[PDB]
């Protein structure tokens, strides 16, 4: 009795090889093409040129950056090693499974970019302090564990909701700082790395939200309403926790009010990516022009 016979039994259909000549969902190919074409590595950006401006930054600024970047690094660590991966089994097409492997890899590249920035500008005590801060912080650990509870759960649709919220919402309490600083001529090369990351995350959230929408419409009227309710519920939970997290990061700086608006702006985009209307009135998402500007 071969150590594998039992398996070859429980799985009688032939194992299929991916065929990119027959694509059910052209969306997978458009996205595969956009993500692979947007390949980049942090080494290609001269972060060493931000050393002067990094020095010109106040202590509170350097400190906020270390922490924000560490929080971002942590989210991409989860998304690359646990998130994107958890979506594989529920893929509608094999081409979609291929896209998720690109997403998982690009997330490791995102996490690594921050280390390239840190190592070029910061000091080890700073790096070490930042990383310790990230393990101790209750709001950061809380959002990291809520998202993980879903990836480790058994609900395919929920995993996609959590992932779209992480990609379209959780990352921005963070992207705000480098966009703020770069509009004020601080850490511009570093902002270029952030822009490449943002170019990926916008696609990631768009694509995964798209797959959640196609999945959800495959359900009964009642179930569809339950998933809608589930999404808004998690969105509020994540949002409240992000508020407390934002207060702790930006208050010394006094950027808090503008950051909170940036959060509501992205919470809406995350819900739209999932096919739902926003959670916040438009007037409550009036983020400073200079910020949404730095982006595009």
Which range in 99-107, 165-173, 252-260, 268-276 contacts a second copy by CB under 8 A?
Answer: 99-107
Which partner in a second copy, Fe ion, none is near 3 (CB below 5 to 8 A by kind)? a second copy
Contact letters for Fe ion, residues 164-183 (x by CB under 5 A): ---x----------------
In angstroms, give the least distance from the CB of 223 to a second copy.
Answer: 16
Catalytic residue among 4, 100, 114, 210: 114
242 binds Fe ion (CB under 5 A): no
120 binds a second copy (CB under 8 A): no
In the chain the first and final C-alpha atoms are separated, in Å, by: 62
CA atoms of 145 and 143, how far apart (whole Å): 5
What are the C-alpha distances in Å from 14 to residues 8, 9, 11, 17, 165? 10, 11, 8, 9, 36
150 binds a second copy (CB under 8 A): yes
Longest dimension (CA), the chain: 70
11 marked among binding-site residues: no
Among 63, 78, 216, 274, binds a second copy (CB under 8 A): 78
210 a catalytic residue: no
26 binds a second copy (CB under 8 A): no
31 binds a second copy (CB under 8 A): no
76 marked among binding-site residues: yes
Question: Which one, of 223, 110, 211, 226, lies nearest residue 164 by Cα?
Answer: 211
Sign of the dihedral through C-alpha 106, 111, 115, 120: positive
Nearer to a second copy, 15 or 185 (CB): 15
Which partner in a second copy, Fe ion, none is near 247 (CB below 5 to 8 A by kind)? Fe ion
Which residues form the catalytic set? Answer: 114
User: Which residues bind to a second copy, rule: CB under 8 A?
Assistant: 1-4, 6-8, 11, 14-21, 32, 36, 39, 41, 70-71, 73-74, 77-78, 80-82, 85, 88, 94, 97-98, 101-102, 104-109, 111-112, 115-116, 118-119, 124, 127, 131, 134-136, 141-142, 144-146, 148-150, 152-153, 233, 236-237
């Amino acid at each position: 009795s071969n150590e594998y016979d039992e398996y070859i039994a429980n799985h009688t259909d032939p194992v299929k090889a991916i065929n990119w000549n027959v694509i059910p969902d052209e969306k997978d190919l458009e996205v595969w093409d956009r993500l692979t074409g947007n390949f980049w590595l942090p080494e290609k950006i001269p972060v060493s040129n931000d050393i002067q401006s990094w020095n010109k930054m106040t202590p509170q600024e350097q400190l906020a950056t270390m922490r924000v970047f560490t929080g971002l690094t942590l989210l991409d660590t989860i998304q690359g090693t646990v998130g994107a991966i958890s979506l594989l089994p529920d893929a509608e097409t094999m081409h979609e499974e291929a896209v998720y492997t690109n997403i998982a890899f690009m997330e490791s590249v995102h996490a690594k970019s921050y280390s390239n920035i840190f190592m070029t500008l910061a000091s080890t005590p700073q790096i070490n302090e930042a990383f310790r801060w990230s393990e101790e912080n209750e709001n950061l650990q809380r959002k990291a564990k809520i998202i993980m509870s879903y990836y480790n759960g058994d609900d395919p649709l929920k995993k996609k909701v959590a992932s779209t919220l992480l990609e379209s919402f959780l990352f921005y309490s963070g992207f705000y700082l480098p966009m703020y600083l770069s509009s004020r001529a601080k850490l511009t090369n570093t902002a270029d790395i952030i822009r490449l990351i943002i170019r990926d995350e916008s696609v990631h959230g768009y694509y995964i939200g798209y797959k959640y929408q196609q999945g959800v419409k495959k359900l009964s009227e009642a179930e569809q309403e339950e998933y809608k309710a589930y999404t808004f519920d998690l969105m509020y939970d994540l949002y409240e926790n992000e508020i407390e997290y934002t207060e702790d990061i930006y208050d010394d700086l006094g950027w808090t009010e503008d950051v909170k608006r940036f959060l509501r702006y992205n919470a809406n985009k995350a819900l739209n990516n999932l096919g739902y209307e926003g959670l916040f009135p438009t007037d409550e998402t009036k983020v400073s022009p200079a910020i949404l500007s730095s982006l595009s």
